[PDB]
From Swiss-Prot:
The lineage of its organism: Viruses, Riboviria, Pararnavirae, Artverviricota, Revtraviricetes. The gene is gag. The chain holds residues 2 to 100 of 658 of the full protein. This is Matrix protein p10. A lipid is attached at G2 (N-myristoyl glycine). It comes from the Viruses. Matrix protein. It is found in: Virion.
Length: 100
């Protein structure tokens, strides 16, 4: 964290609790990074921050939902291509997530 918790940020924390009951186990920082990536989709083409591979699964499903909801405009095939580049950056740097 390290950032003030606004009413909107507090809602996400409660949402994460419900996700845990559904069977989700990810770091809280990953949730904050998720919002940053979404803003990078259009607002800033360049990416910034390390993305956890475990959370990547949620992004793939979340982005797919937005695609059908709106279309390729919100998340086109560029999202997958850009993610492929990120996978290499994180894959090159060894990390120790929750497990292994």
């Amino acid at each position: 964290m390290g950032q003030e918790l606004s009413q909107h940020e507090r809602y996400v924390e409660q949402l994460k609790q419900a996700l845990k009951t559904r069977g989700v186990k990810v770091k809280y920082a990953d949730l904050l990074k998720f919002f940053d990536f979404v803003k990078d989709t259009c607002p800033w083409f360049p990416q910034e921050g390390t993305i956890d591979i475990k959370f990547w699964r949620r992004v793939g499903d979340c982005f797919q939902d937005y695609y059908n909801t709106f279309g390729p405009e919100k998340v086109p095939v560029t999202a997958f291509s850009y993610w492929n580049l990120i996978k290499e950056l994180i894959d090159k740097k060894e990390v120790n997530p929750q497990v292994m």
